[PDB]
Amino acid sequence: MNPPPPETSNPNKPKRQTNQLQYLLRVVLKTLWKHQFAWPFQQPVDAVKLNLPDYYKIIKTPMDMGTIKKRLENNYYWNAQECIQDFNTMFTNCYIYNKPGDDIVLMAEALEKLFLQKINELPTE
């Protein structure tokens, strides 16, 4: 069964915009989004549709690029490290749930390298 998706806005959580958060949305997220391997990561894992009944029995901190995008659009993060942490959570969840050699893991690995490539240099303040 599917849990509620991660929140994308919270009235108790303070919002912020930085030059690095604008970078992560405009170039990092939006370039990754257009990659040929992006499609499995553009929305939360639908355990019912994908016939993965154990996915949320294993993954207790789910994360996907659609949630990250909405969070960036809503100024949900305080800084860039908070957003990068969500990207790393998405990738690690995929390696936790699946095994080396799986097609999904090969796709995740390709996207992680491109992500690291792009966050290697970020803008300044």
Shortest-Cβ-distance residue relative to ligand J4O: 40
Mask of contacts with ligand J4O, 45-84, x by CB under 6 A?
Answer: x----x-x--------------------------------
Contact 28, 90 (CB under 8 A): no
Q: 124, 122, 42: which is closest to 90 by C-alpha? A: 42
In the list 21, 63, 84, 94, the residue contacting ligand J4O (rule: CB under 6 A) is 94
Query: C-alpha dihedral over 90, 34, 125, 88, to 10 degrees?
Result: 10
How many residues make contact with ligand J4O (CB under 6 A)?
11
How many alpha carbons fall within 13 Å on the CB side of residue 1?
A: 2
The binding site for ligand J4O (CB under 6 A) comprises 39-41, 43, 45, 50, 52, 94, 97-98, 104
